[PDB]
Design a binder for this molecule. Structure first.
Ligand SMILES: O=P(O)(O)OC[C@H](O)CO
Ligand SMILES: [Zn+2]
Ligand SMILES: [Zn+2]
Ligand SMILES: [Zn+2]
Ligand SMILES: [Zn+2]
Ligand SMILES: [Zn+2]
Length: 308
């Protein structure tokens, strides 16, 4: 039986990790004993940059982490996941299916990474701090934790704050010791990881979309049989779907629990933050020329169809 390590940042309480358990269950059983996927959560195995380096280098390894980690190999990914880019899940889910992004998946395959899915949404990310934010002026001074990614660092700097890059498992201690003053993330993350025990003011900037890619090494993928590739693809797709509808169901429920734990939700000057992050799109030289303009062309098209 072929052992494949599935590694992820998500703690056991988070929806993504709950969905991954079902996915591994199903894949292992459908393989009639030929595959043994093993799920490692909470960053117990390498994640982010160290995780993807394993995928890219041919390991028997599936990584479930941000789309931004694909971008260290195929730069255009960070543009497709830009700040204030999407207003809804459906906008992103459709962008992902365009030939523009399917081409990105193939550039990634040149690099040793087989992208199985970009559909593992977990929500729009907001400020989790100790003061309300209405404007970028308010952000001034705050040491805010960001994921280890240029896109997140640049975005938060552009919003007025001082980004401090670290993997999520390091956040709790950083908050306890005063190294950081807050962080950012979606409702499901906020509640799932219980950060409301440390920070009570939640400001709705909706700056980025929290979204995981699911990636397996080209070398392992190619070495499998046809039936095994079918089973793995089908089950991660069914998982993406489970994860998505659970996320849509839980956001409302969780926000109410967050309020019951003394979290106050704050509205933001949307127009201001929008003008504030616009320079982030001019901060990546390795993007293919005109990528923002082509993204916008699809996004505009996608929006028209949604209205109709
Ligand atoms: O995207 P991250 O790195 O901030 O982590 C979000 C997860 O919900 C935390 O386990
Ligand atoms: Zn566990
Ligand atoms: Zn089961
Ligand atoms: Zn749809
Ligand atoms: Zn307020
Ligand atoms: Zn520009």
């Amino acid at each position: 039986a072929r052992v494949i390590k599935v590694t992820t940042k998500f703690v056991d309480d988070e929806q993504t990790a709950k969905s991954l358990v079902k996915v591994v269950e199903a894949i292992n059983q459908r393989s009639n004993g030929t595959l043994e996927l093993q799920l490692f959560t909470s960053g117990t195995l390498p994640i982010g940059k160290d995780g993807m380096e394993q995928v890219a280098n041919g390991s028997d390894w599936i990584l479930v982490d941000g789309v931004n980690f694909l971008g260290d190999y195929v730069p255009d990914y960070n543009a497709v996941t830009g700040p204030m880019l999407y207003q809804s899940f459906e906008e992103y889910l459709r962008m992902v299916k365009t030939p523009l992004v399917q081409d990105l998946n193939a550039q990634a395959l040149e690099k040793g990474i087989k992208v199985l899915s970009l559909d593992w949404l977990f929500g729009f990310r907001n400020i989790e701090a100790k003061k309300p934010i209405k404007t970028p002026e308010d952000m001034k001074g705050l040491k805010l934790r960001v994921p280890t990614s240029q896109l997140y660092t640049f975005t938060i700097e552009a919003m007025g704050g001082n980004p401090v890059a670290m993997p999520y498992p390091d956040t709790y201690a950083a908050l306890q010791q005063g190294v950081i003053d807050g962080l950012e993330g979606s409702i499901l993350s906020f509640y799932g990881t219980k950060q409301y025990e440390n920070v009570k003011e939640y400001s709705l900037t909706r700056h980025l979309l929290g979204v995981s890619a699911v990636c397996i090494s080209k070398k392992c993928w190619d070495s499998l049989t046809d039936e095994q590739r079918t089973i793995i693809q089908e089950e991660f797709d069914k998982g993406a779907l489970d994860n998505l509808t659970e996320t849509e169901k839980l956001e409302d429920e969780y926000a109410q629990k967050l309020k019951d734990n003394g979290v106050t939700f704050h509205e933001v000057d949307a127009e201001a933050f929008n003008k504030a992050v616009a320079p982030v799109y001019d901060k990546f030289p390795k993007w293919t020329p005109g990528i923002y303009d082509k993204i916008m062309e699809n996004l505009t098209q996608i929006r028209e169809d949604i209205k109709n």
